[PDB]
Paper text:
Crystal structures of LepFNR reveal a typical plastidic type reductase, analogous in its folding architecture to the enzymes found in plant and cyanobacteria, in spite of displaying an important divergence at primary structure level.
The quality of the LepFNR crystal structure, refined to 2.4 Å resolution, is fine as judged by stereochemical and refinement parameters. The main chain atoms of Ser97, Ile115, Lys117 and Leu95 interact directly with flavin moiety creating the core of the binding site. The phenol ring of the carboxyl terminal tyrosine (Tyr314) and the flavin group are practically coplanar maximizing π-orbital overlapping, as have been observed in all plastidic class FNRs, resulting in a large portion of the isoalloxazine moiety shielded from the bulk solution. Surprisingly, in LepFNR FAD acquired a different conformation in which its adenine moiety interacts with Phe130. LepFNR, on the other hand, exhibits higher sequential identity with plant FNRs and does not contain cysteine residues in the position required to form the intermolecular disulfide bridge. This analysis strongly suggests that metal mediated LepFNR dimerization, observed in the crystal structure, is induced by crystallization effects and do not represent a physiologically relevant oligomeric state of the protein.
Author numbering: 7 to 122, 125 to 314
The structure:
Amino acid sequence: PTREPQINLFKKSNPYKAKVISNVLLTPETGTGKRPKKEGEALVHRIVLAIDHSAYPYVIGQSGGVIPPGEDPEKKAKGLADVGYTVRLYSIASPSYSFGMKEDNIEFIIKRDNIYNGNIQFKGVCSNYMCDLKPGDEVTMTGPSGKKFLLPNTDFSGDIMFLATGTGIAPFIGMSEELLEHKLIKFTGNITLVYGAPYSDELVMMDYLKGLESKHKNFKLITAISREEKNSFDGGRMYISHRVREQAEAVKKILNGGGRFYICGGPKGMEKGVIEEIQKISGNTGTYEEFKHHLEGAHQLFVETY
Ligand SMILES: Cc1cc2nc3c(=O)[nH]c(=O)nc-3n(C[C@H](O)[C@H](O)[C@H](O)COP(=O)(O)OP(=O)(O)OC[C@H]3O[C@@H](n4cnc5c(N)ncnc54)[C@H](O)[C@@H]3O)c2cc1C
Ligand SMILES: [Zn+2]
């Protein structure tokens, strides 16, 4: 809620207690779905927490921090006096004011983060804790966090490209709802959401995303399914970067027309492949770092990869 991003309103020393409204599995149950056996699990949940929007006045594009319960064995073993698990950040998935502008909740799209043969080797603490949440459970929350990855706060005529891998869809759920529905700003640009996931059933919120596309004309949904689609350029796996290339004219509308690219998801540093594809499109032959900083300087690139 309320515009103007605030950060670190809540920290480990003064956390925010949020109650679980819902935590539903978005992807097929393990063993079901396209992902084989080897190739681990892909268990992604939409977590809806009840929050006081006056206490937690988050902006879409920000992260919510979660402190998972318990002692961290690495910290006990290192003899820290800290010992509590460190915050894990999760992109907020819900629009600033919540769906329906109800100001009642916060949402997260959280993958089970495990290693995996296909059988579990190492279990992610916070992602699993979060995906294990039952209605009415209390989440220790931190933040809000981040003040870069944000939507325009004034009227915007520029085109916006949302570039997502997996859970990186999160900010763009809320961002798209906000831009198309909430109209906190007048948005007269085109949204292109490029959403990458390994399997079609590992893409989440698709009914909702396709629905936005059919309701608007303002909104284009493109998916890149890396283990089911080959790209036309080299026949390799389809990634959002290949979709970006396919969408050269839309990318050029953004490059030339003051629009924005938002890149969110994994793995860490995946924006590089995307940006350098945007760079090929622009015809710029400077260093990756020159082009990216230029774009960020121009407010035309926002990256949150992890
Ligand atoms: C700004 C930002 C936004 C984010 N947004 C989202 C989001 O929207 N949705 C989302 O799902 N995630 C998001 N993430 C990632 C999230 O914050 C966590 O990092 C993620 O959930 C994994 O945390 P974890 O506590 O579950 O795993 P951790 O316990 O911290 O470990 C990470 C990985 O290491 C493995 N591991 C554990 N022990 C070992 C060991 N012994 N040796 C080798 N490997 C080991 C685990 O299996 C796991 O796969 C975001 C991250 C950032 C920084
Ligand atoms: Zn609408």
